[PDB]
Design a protein around this ligand. Structure first.
Ligand code: HEM
Length: 445
């Protein structure tokens, strides 16, 4: 079996680590041109095989965890932040049971409740913005999305305990998602690691007293906490108070920097394209009514332009750039055999700008989906939340949360660039962030 084409590097251990780190997207696009869909190279003594394009990505998106393993690549980062016994610290079947439990609060019946929760939070938060100014929308959306996801997913006994202190602790635990946490051992006396371990212990404790409060409650609430508190594995094994907390902390942290970056990038795409922005505001009136009543789940699904703007934002600025698995069984793709031991990776970001499939690939064209597009015309060209089995379980909530916030924000304000500056992409963080994300705003009406 032919091994995928390898990119030679004169750098022994680091390999292509630095050239990749500077512009990973340009690195992979150039490799696609010179080497094709499947190629391999080493970074930090690890050998990576990338699957570019829809046909190649199919291998990972259709794979089973026995063949292409997730825990191998993601636990050393994850376990320190979310805690033991949860997510990638447990066998995949046990994780699948945890995932299904979480689904009990990730459905339409609950999303109808979430819409008015998120709208009200968006309004109350942006009270502090006044009538106009120049503020960092990324910092703002981070703070709002913490309060909104804690309210809808964690409950009101945790949301009432949410202050600036606890918001810092969540950012301290988010510091555990570093390249240093991935490569260097976790016990090392490094600053980010101590803040994670310290916050973890403190956040768990806030969650422990909220769990007890509910356990001794007269009435029951239909929400995710209630399920996790009253649920058992098939074995009949109950969840620990530690497991419940970790699953909740992990649920919120998975959709924070993912939703906060996307939400912010869309503002800039809409601030740059002023006519496209007003048309979205016009849709608020046409779909919901001239009185602009409180948003409903049903209304959100009729905001088609806004959906395409969210879709186009996710195409050009997806938060998760690489999806990674470890080869335990030899896999076959494009006539090559990937050897057990290679880390097989797919980049949604690259597949969603591949000149071979995307017309005007670098243009924010939300009407690209009203005509022939790779998102409908290929299986794995548009894969921002993943695909096949390896899909995001929070995708539907991400859409409700982002549509509700931005519907609410569009009603509240009109947005513009400051001297026509569009934020460059900060490639140095795992979730690519916008540089200098200060936006100009004024009151719409
Ligand atoms: C724009 C928003 C979001 C995007 C693009 C996104 C993207 C992704 C992707 C690509 C994965 C797959 C990772 C892998 O299998 O290697 C994933 C998994 C996951 N996401 Fe999201 N996500 C978003 C928002 C959220 C939200 C709002 C939540 C929860 C409320 C969430 C929770 C999760 C969880 C729990 C997983 C489980 C990983 C697994 O099953 O292996 N995400 N997400």
């Amino acid at each position: 079996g032919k091994l995928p084409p390898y990119i030679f590097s004169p750098i022994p251990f680091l390999g292509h680590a630095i050239a990749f780190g500077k512009s990973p997207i340009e690195f992979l696009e150039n490799a696609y041109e010179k080497y094709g869909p499947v190629f391999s190279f080493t970074m930090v003594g690890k050998t990576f095989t990338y699957l570019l394009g829809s046909d190649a990505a199919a291998l990972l998106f259709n794979s089973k965890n026995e063949d292409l393993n997730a825990e191998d690549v993601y636990s050393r980062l994850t376990t320190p932040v979310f805690g033991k016994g949860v997510a990638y610290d447990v066998p995949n079947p046990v994780f699948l049971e945890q995932k299904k439990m979480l689904k009990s609060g990730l459905n339409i019946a609950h999303f109808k409740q979430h819409v008015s929760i998120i709208e009200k939070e968006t309004k109350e938060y942006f009270e502090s913005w006044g009538e106009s100014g120049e503020k960092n929308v990324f910092e703002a959306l981070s703070e709002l999305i913490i309060l909104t996801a804690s309210h809808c997913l964690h409950g009101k006994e945790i949301r009432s305990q949410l202050n600036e202190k606890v918001a810092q602790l969540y950012a301290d635990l988010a510091g555990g998602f570093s390249h240093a946490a991935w490569l260097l051992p976790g016990w090392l006396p490094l600053p980010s690691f101590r803040r994670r371990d310290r916050a973890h212990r403190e956040i768990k404790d806030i969650f422990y007293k909220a769990i007890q409060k509910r356990r001794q409650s007269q009435e029951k609430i239909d929400d995710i906490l209630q399920t996790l508190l009253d649920a058992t594995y098939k074995d009949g094994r109950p969840l620990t108070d530690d497991e419940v907390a970790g699953m909740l902390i992990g649920l919120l942290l998975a959709g924070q920097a993912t939703s906060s970056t996307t939400s912010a990038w869309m503002g800039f795409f809409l601030a740059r394209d002023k006519t496209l922005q007003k048309k979205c505001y016009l849709e608020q009136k046409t779909v919901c009514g001239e009185n602009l009543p409180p948003l409903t789940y049903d209304q959100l699904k009729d905001l088609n332009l806004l959906d395409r703007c969210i879709k186009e934002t996710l195409r050009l600025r997806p938060p998760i750039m690489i999806m990674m698995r470890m080869a335990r069984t030899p896999q076959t793709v494009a006539g090559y055999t990937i050897p057990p031991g290679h880390q097989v990776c797919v980049s949604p970001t690259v597949n969603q700008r591949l000149k071979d499939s995307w017309v005007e690939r670098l243009d924010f064209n939300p009407d690209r989906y009203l005509q022939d597009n790779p998102a409908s015309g290929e299986k794995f060209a548009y894969v921002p939340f993943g695909a096949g089995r390896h899909r995001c379980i929070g995708e539907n909530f991400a859409y409700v949360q982002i549509k509700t916030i931005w519907s609410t924000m569009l009603r509240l304000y009109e947005f513009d660039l400051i001297d026509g500056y569009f934020p460059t992409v900060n490639y140095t963080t795992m979730i690519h962030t916008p540089e200098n994300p200060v936006i100009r705003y004024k009151r719409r009406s």
